[PDB]
Design a protein around this nucleic acid. Structure first.
Ligand code: K
Ligand code: K
Ligand code: K
Ligand code: K
Ligand code: K
Ligand code: K
Ligand code: K
Ligand code: K
Ligand code: K
Ligand code: K
Ligand code: K
Ligand code: K
Ligand code: K
Ligand code: K
Ligand code: K
Ligand code: K
Ligand code: K
Ligand code: K
Ligand code: K
Ligand code: K
Ligand code: K
Ligand code: K
Ligand code: K
Ligand code: K
Ligand code: K
Ligand code: K
Ligand code: K
Ligand code: K
Ligand code: K
Ligand code: K
Ligand code: K
Ligand code: K
Ligand code: K
Ligand code: K
Ligand code: K
Ligand code: K
Ligand code: K
Ligand code: K
Ligand code: K
Ligand code: K
Ligand code: K
Ligand code: K
Ligand code: K
Ligand code: K
Ligand code: K
Ligand code: K
Ligand code: K
Ligand code: K
Ligand code: K
Ligand code: K
Ligand code: K
Ligand code: MG
Ligand code: MG
Ligand code: MG
Ligand code: MG
Ligand code: MG
Ligand code: MG
Ligand code: MG
Ligand code: MG
Ligand code: MG
Ligand code: MG
Ligand code: MG
Ligand code: MG
Ligand code: MG
Ligand code: MG
Ligand code: MG
Ligand code: MG
Ligand code: MG
Ligand code: MG
Ligand code: MG
Ligand code: MG
Lengths: 159, 133, 148, 211
RNA sequence: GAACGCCCCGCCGGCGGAUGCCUCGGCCCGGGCGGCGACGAAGAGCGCGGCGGAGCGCGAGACGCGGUGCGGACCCGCCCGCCCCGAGAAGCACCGACCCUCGAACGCAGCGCGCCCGGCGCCGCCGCCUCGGCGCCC
RNA sequence: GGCCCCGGGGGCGAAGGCGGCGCGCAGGCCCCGCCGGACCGGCCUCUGGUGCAGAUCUCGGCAGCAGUAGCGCUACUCCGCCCCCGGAGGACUGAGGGGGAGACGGGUUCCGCGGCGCCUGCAUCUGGCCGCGGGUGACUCGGGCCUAAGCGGCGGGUGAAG
RNA sequence: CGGCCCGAGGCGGCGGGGGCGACGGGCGGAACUUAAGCAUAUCAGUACGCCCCGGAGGAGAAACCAACCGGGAUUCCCCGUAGCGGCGAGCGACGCGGGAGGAGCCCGCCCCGAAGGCGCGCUGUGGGCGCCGCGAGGGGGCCCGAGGGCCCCGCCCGAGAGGGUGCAAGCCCCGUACGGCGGGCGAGUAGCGCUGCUUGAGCGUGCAGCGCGAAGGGAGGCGCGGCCCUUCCAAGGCUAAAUACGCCCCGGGACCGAUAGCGGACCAAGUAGCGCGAGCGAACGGUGAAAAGGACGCCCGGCCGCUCAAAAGACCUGAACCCGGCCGGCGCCGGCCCGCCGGCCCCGUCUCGAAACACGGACCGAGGAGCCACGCGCCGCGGCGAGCCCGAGGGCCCCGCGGCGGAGCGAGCGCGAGACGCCCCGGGCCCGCCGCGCCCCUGCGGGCGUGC
């Protein structure tokens, strides 16, 4: 099976020379709270993103870009990241001894985290003195309100 | 070492190919050397055996030279003239001892139009090879 | 390998280690786990407390990544800093240049307080803290921060 | 196999043993009946492969190569090394395309008796194996490792010779019979790119030498 | 006592088909391919060779006919036939035809009969010819 | 899968078979003589459909028993010369026949010539056995037609379908 | 009497019907079995029966998932527990994440109105891999029935894969390596009530009958009513790829070797033979290098001898059980040279106990029964170690996510471990669950303590 699939993609690559095997796909954020800070490859680019750079759906499809008109952006940073990706790709494309790009086009890379610095004094004014008490009040806010209502109802009905 | 993958290296399949071969393949399988003199003249190393060829035999218990009287293609052997089983009577007929064509060198060839032409065909092909190499 | 096994050292012995009085029969106790309340009760009570019955609330579909919650101790915070800059941060302990560690970038949410920290100020940014984690950090001169 | 026929037990009361029988009375469907099934038929779901960790595989390759560089284990493995200059044997050959020139180099270095040992040992094996496409056995000689130099077309024909490109070395070729010390004829380029190969292995360090 | 029976101190014979060696066969894996039929399929019956029982093949043009190429001395017995710078045995590949009865099986039946001088089965779609209705109207 | 120091043993005789000595506590191993006529191993590492006295075991061959138990329908004899053919004698079936013919079933068993390998539970020169040739002719006999008891078909009806 | 409507007979052209031991789609649908009994459950939404395509088929461009600093039609591969249940035995999805592959669209509705495919249609057409061919290179001497054997001296090698040849052949012959041709958005509907089947779907996963029957509507894994938020648009349709597979052809194998391997290796096996029928179904491989397949003579089938290395003579070798002729003698262990003396019940099995009047076993040969897959526990060894890891896949080599371990406890809201110790055992103290003094800041919240 490994050999069969390699032969098939070799034939297709010859047929469509010098196009790449893959379309340009967007960079998107993984769905969970658990996979929250890293990116991956999506299905297509939004029409808002295409309106960023000029291209229409047909024109982008022709020059080799996956376009997904069912996706909607959730913020402005999504747009900025993907418009940078579109803009750079349109920079790096040529249109007609040519070179046929291999693999995924512009792979997504997730950088390792670096350490930063700062000042204790400016850090302190962001937090109260008893952070654990602060957090505990926020955590128990609703339950205490229900209990407070129940007590006030006790006294009210018992006059 | 073989490289070609449509050709078996399986003993069962090779032996079944040697038997049950068709007549043209069997005829090609029944070849023998040309002598040095005919090698010089025709520039060819081997020929399929035939009636009317004169053959010089070695490596066997029936050694001699004679003309090919019969071809037993089912057996892959040839009945030569003068080379017989030792008979019992003084009168009774001869009975040929069958010789296998690879135990012979052909000494003098039967010629006709087809023999001439196929030899010249083979020379021109060997020349193509010699020009390539 | 078949040639190093117990079963072949029993050739010429009739029964093969299974006994003459008892023997080897199909299923002399039943199949599977059956009998746990009747004739296997001694086994089930000796080795499996709380195998029978019911306990607690049930959820018809659990959200695995909602309920996911990784955690880090404060004795691990200084190993997320690469090895080639801790010596310097330790030598020049600064209120004006302090190491900032963000633990959600490394994939932890809450910070607990097992262990101890070196005598050096540090900001730690997480999404929730435990009481003695806060205590020990604010005791060494660090600051707890909440990160989005 | 064994279960296409129709057979059932006759029962007690007819003075015969109780196995299943074909219409007529012939025994069937027992491992002890002629024409019955196997007691436990063989099946292709047997686990045929085995797993080895990547460090362990690399360590086996490196220990086989370490063994290859001893004049004592190579002589005790079976090769003929009486007229060789060195056991780490590095020879610059450039390109060899004719078997006659490859034999010439092997003679000029001193590996001629190993190849003659291999050549004069071809025989027909002792058992059933000669009905199953394994009719002849030859002994094993030198292994040539090459990097940038066309040599396979000049060395392959020789009896008891094997070819290995230096970037992918085979443990089954380094330790034939599971015996480590193979005689290796090294090209200069292969012997000079060995360290580069181990540098190309990623997040890998060689194991510690010992006494 | 001999003889019968038994054991073998050895030498030969029977009956039987084990053991050893061999193998144009099985089994397993993988890769191809995925190509029937009212223009009559799959399958069945009967018949066909110079001397012809079985199996393969073929269909009253029957152990096969023609065309295009290749090939180049045989054709298992007895007979014929061919033989040669082309005159052509064995063999191979494509293409064109022939293609009895039954069978989705098609004039009815299954071996016997018709209606009419072409021929003559069922369903469906689209057209067309000829027609019915105290349906709606003229 | 390897090794078996100029590359392991073999028609100057392999595997197997039959007798005989030696070694080992033993499982077993090794050698010699005779047969046989083409393949076979000792040591290291790997693998398994890996060792039989028994299962009223399976398949095949086969002993004692043992030259043993056994071979309704009255009946043959003499000569030519066999239970076959001929002549002469003596009997039987006894017209609901051991007679002469059909229906069904069988399928060539029918006829002539020849024969004894098989069969003819004894024999055979006999034969429904074996070989080689042959053989059944319809306006008037039957089938084809008619309908019996029945069976099928019919715009359609029903059922997830058949 | 004509038109339109609804029908009838005939004629022409075109299409359908049957066939397959797989893969695929739609229906109907068991029981054995497990639960150590047996009704629910399980087996199994399987066997089997009926229908229907194709080279694949089915599915498919959200009336989707979710709860995020969010994804984005369908299929397939890797990976892993919510729940169901005489809460028993058992049963059991999926999203997120990593890969293979990647592709999108149009009818009704609305506008034009015959512009159309014009004998129709205004009850609405039309537009918006296979075929060829060449092909290198060894003699001389012994001996044999026969040189591929033994001795000694060589050649070819891009070819020492192999088959044949009278005995182990690179060089005796076919082949083998190296190359040429073809190439504006869907009504008896959605939903609801009652009932039957089905699902992990639990006060309903999906379907269906019957009764009722909408307008903005659907969904958010616990019901009802109200207010919000997030996210989609059912009741119409088409669509490549990645995926699965017998027959037949091709290649390979640590597989079987004639009672094995398919039932079937044998010029005539689903054959001969058996059954009214549905159906059942064997046994039988091997002369020799060459048929050279058996001269001449003598008796009246036999004897002599003939071919051949050899009868190997209807055929390779040719064991055992059992038997015939010639020769010798009249059970195991032990001593002695040898027929005396001493000892010795029939094994296997169940059983307290077998020589048993307990059962199996006339004899002989060949065959004949703890193997494999998955899951769980413990032990040993190898590699690396707060880490570890040949998923799938992509380029015996190289790159490669989960996952498991790293923190526990609590029904849950949740909270959350340092203090000692060569090792082991015990003591003490810390974390969670249950309880209770006391102090306080942001408060049924924080701190500090006491107890099983
Ligand atoms: K045991
Ligand atoms: K017991
Ligand atoms: K039981
Ligand atoms: K049981
Ligand atoms: K059970
Ligand atoms: K139980
Ligand atoms: K409860
Ligand atoms: K069966
Ligand atoms: K029995
Ligand atoms: K029994
Ligand atoms: K069988
Ligand atoms: K590893
Ligand atoms: K390795
Ligand atoms: K053997
Ligand atoms: K085996
Ligand atoms: K008797
Ligand atoms: K006669
Ligand atoms: K119906
Ligand atoms: K069912
Ligand atoms: K059942
Ligand atoms: K029951
Ligand atoms: K039951
Ligand atoms: K039940
Ligand atoms: K249940
Ligand atoms: K059930
Ligand atoms: K139970
Ligand atoms: K892709
Ligand atoms: K020859
Ligand atoms: K309606
Ligand atoms: K409804
Ligand atoms: K269920
Ligand atoms: K429930
Ligand atoms: K109703
Ligand atoms: K909800
Ligand atoms: K639900
Ligand atoms: K719900
Ligand atoms: K059989
Ligand atoms: K017993
Ligand atoms: K008993
Ligand atoms: K007892
Ligand atoms: K006993
Ligand atoms: K006993
Ligand atoms: K007794
Ligand atoms: K007794
Ligand atoms: K007795
Ligand atoms: K007993
Ligand atoms: K009894
Ligand atoms: K009993
Ligand atoms: K007994
Ligand atoms: K692993
Ligand atoms: K609790
Ligand atoms: Mg014991
Ligand atoms: Mg027991
Ligand atoms: Mg009880
Ligand atoms: Mg029986
Ligand atoms: Mg079998
Ligand atoms: Mg015939
Ligand atoms: Mg066995
Ligand atoms: Mg026993
Ligand atoms: Mg009378
Ligand atoms: Mg007669
Ligand atoms: Mg008789
Ligand atoms: Mg009449
Ligand atoms: Mg039960
Ligand atoms: Mg189920
Ligand atoms: Mg489809
Ligand atoms: Mg159910
Ligand atoms: Mg068989
Ligand atoms: Mg014999
Ligand atoms: Mg008995
Ligand atoms: Mg046996």
């Amino acid at each position: 099976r490994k050999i069969r699939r390699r032969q098939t993609r070799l034939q297709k690559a010859k047929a469509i020379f010098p196009c790449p095997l893959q379309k340009l796909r967007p960079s998107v954020t993984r769905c969970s709270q658990k996979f929250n800070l890293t990116q991956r490859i999506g299905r297509g680019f939004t029409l808002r993103e295409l309106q960023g750079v000029g291209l229409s759906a047909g024109k982008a499809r022709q020059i080799g870009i996956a376009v997904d008109p069912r996706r909607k952006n959730k913020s402005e940073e999504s747009v900025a990241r993907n418009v940078a990706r579109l803009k750079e790709y349109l920079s790096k494309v040529t249109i007609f001894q040519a070179i046929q790009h291999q693999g995924v086009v512009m792979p997504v890379v997730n950088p390792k985290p670096v350490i930063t610095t700062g000042s204790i004094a400016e850090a302190k004014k962001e937090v109260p003195e008893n952070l654990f008490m602060y957090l505990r009040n926020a955590r128990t806010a609703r339950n205490r309100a229900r209990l407070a209502k129940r007590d006030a109802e006790r006294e009210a009905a018992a006059k | 070492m073989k490289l070609n993958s449509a050709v078996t290296a399986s003993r069962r399949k090779c032996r079944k190919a040697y038997f049950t071969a068709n007549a043209e393949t069997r005829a090609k399988m029944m070849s023998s050397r040309l002598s040095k003199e005919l090698r010089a003249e025709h520039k060819i190393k081997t020929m399929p055996i035939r009636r009317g060829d004169i053959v010089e035999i070695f490596t066997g218990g029936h050694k001699g030279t004679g003309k090919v009287v019969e071809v037993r293609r089912r057996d892959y052997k040839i009945c030569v003239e003068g080379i017989n089983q030792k008979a019992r009577n003084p009168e009774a007929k001869p009975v040929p001892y069958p010789i296998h064509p690879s135990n012979c060198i052909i000494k003098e060839l039967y010629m006709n139009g087809s023999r001439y032409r196929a030899i010249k065909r083979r020379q021109e092909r060997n020349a193509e090879r010699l020009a390539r190499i | 390998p078949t040639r190093i096994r117990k079963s072949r050292k029993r050739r010429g012995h009739r029964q093969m280690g299974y006994g003459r009085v008892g023997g080897h029969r199909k299923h002399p106790s039943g199949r599977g786990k059956a009998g746990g309340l009747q004739h296997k009760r001694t086994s089930f009570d000796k080795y499996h407390p709380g195998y029978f019955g019911k306990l607690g609330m049930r959820n018809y579909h659990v959200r695995r990544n909602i309920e996911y919650n990784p955690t880090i101790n404060i004795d691990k915070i200084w190993s997320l800093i690469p090895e080639e800059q801790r010596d310097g941060f330790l030598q020049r302990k600064s209120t004006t240049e302090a190491p900032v560690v963000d633990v959600t970038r490394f994939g932890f949410f809450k910070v607990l307080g097992r262990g101890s920290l070196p005598q050096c100020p540090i900001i730690i940014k997480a999404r929730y803290f435990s009481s003695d984690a806060e205590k020990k950090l604010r005791e060494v001169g660090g600051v707890p921060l909440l990160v989005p | 196999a064994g279960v296409q026929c129709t057979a059932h037990s006759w029962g007690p009361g007819r003075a015969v043993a109780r196995l299943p029988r074909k219409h007529g009375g012939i025994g069937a469907y027992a491992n002890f009946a002629r024409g019955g099934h196997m007691a436990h038929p063989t099946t292709v779901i047997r686990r045929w492969c085995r797993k080895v960790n990547l460090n362990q595989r690399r360590y086996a390759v490196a220990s086989a190569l370490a063994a290859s560089a001893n004049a004592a284990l190579v002589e005790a493995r079976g090769h003929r090394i009486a007229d060789v200059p060195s056991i780490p044997l590095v020879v610059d050959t450039d390109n060899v395309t004719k078997t006659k020139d490859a034999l010439a180099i092997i003679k000029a270095v001193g590996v001629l008796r190993d190849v003659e040992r291999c050549k004069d040992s071809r025989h027909i094996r002792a058992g059933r194996g000669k009905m199953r496409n394994r009719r002849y056995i030859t002994r094993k000689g030198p292994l040539v490792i090459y990097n940038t130099e066309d040599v396979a077309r000049g060395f392959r024909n020789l009896p008891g010779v094997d070819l290995c490109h230096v970037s992918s070395i085979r443990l089954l070729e380094l330790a034939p019979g599971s015996h480590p010390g193979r005689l290796i004829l090294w090209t200069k380029s292969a012997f000079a790119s060995l360290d580069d190969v181990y540098a190309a292995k990623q997040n890998y360090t060689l194991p510690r030498s010992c006494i």
